[PDB]
Amino acid sequence: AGAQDFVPHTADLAELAAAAGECRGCGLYRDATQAVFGAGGRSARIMMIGEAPGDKEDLAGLPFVGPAGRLLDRALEAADIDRDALYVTNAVKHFKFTRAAGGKRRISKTPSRTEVVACRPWLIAEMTSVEPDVVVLLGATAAKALLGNDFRVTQHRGEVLHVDDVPGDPALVATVHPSSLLRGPKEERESAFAGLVDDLRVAADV
Ligand code: SF4
């Protein structure tokens, strides 16, 4: 089912990334430029999972390279976390999108639960390969992939969670997605940025 038959029997991240370029586990590979796999190494203690590559990631071939990734950089820096010692990835690896007339970018479209279940084999291979001590789930889509489709990120902020069905029983911290911190009132944004730094420190202190 899904991407599972496209996942090779290997923990090498480069072999997995190359294989993900050939994945047809769902329909998202057709309109996307390429598959966006995770960045970082197997020594990483912290795995971070977003929703999906955006417009910038789709053509950069790397995760979190747009404005959201730059805000995440500022949050990681304030939390004293070396990005090079992370493994950063997304719940689904193909960019889902539409264009609006007058647009300045391709608009990110939300992955269905079906596409998240289809791409999960890659996330399982990534966690199996990295064996992280803690997984940071950035946003509702990533959190639900591991904690259940009914999970609410807003109701468990800053909580160290552990679910049994998860490879390696790593600690899980669900937090806001950095793209949510790009817009809104300045005081709401600044308060929300501090909440993200707090959650990143909890994950680093696991
Ligand atoms: S989104 Fe995931 S499951 Fe769907 S085609 Fe891309 S890699 Fe395969």
Structural domain boundaries of the chain? Answer: 1-206
User: Is 177 flagged in the annotation as binding?
Assistant: no
- Ligand 1: nearest atom to the Cα of 111: 1
Please report which residue ranges of 21-112 form alpha helices under DSSP H: 55-60, 67-78
Resolution (A): 2.3
User: Is 156 flagged in the annotation as binding?
Assistant: no
Rounded alpha-carbon distances, angstroms, from residue 87 to 30, 45, 111, 126, 135: 26, 8, 21, 9, 9
- Method by which this entry was solved: X-ray
User: Is 26 flagged in the annotation as binding?
Assistant: yes
Distance of CA 153 to the CA centre of its chain: 14
Dump the DSSP string for 140-197. HHHHHHHH-TT--GGGSTT--B--TTSTT--EEEEE--GGGGSSS-HHHHHHHHHHHH
Contact call for residues 95 and 111 (beta carbons, < 8 A): no
- Ligand 1: nearest atom to the Cα of 32: 6
- Residues flanking ligand 1, CB < 6 Å: 2-3, 20, 23-26, 28-29, 35, 92-94, 115, 118-119, 122
172 C-alpha vs ligand 1 centroid, how far in Å?
A: 23
- Ligand 1: nearest atom to the Cα of 96: 1
174: amino acid identity, one letter: A
Tokens of 54: 């955006």
Which residue, judged by its Cα, is nearest atom 2 of ligand 1?
Answer: 119
Beta-bridged to residue 137, according to DSSP, are: 49, 174
Q: Rounded CA gap, 173 and 87, in Å?
A: 15
Tokens of 200: 């990143």
Regarding beta strands 107-108 and 97-98, do their DSSP bridges make them parallel or antiparallel, or are they unpaired?
antiparallel
Q: Which residues lie closer than 8 Å to 48 by C-beta, 6 or more apart?
A: 86, 87, 88, 89, 135, 136, 138
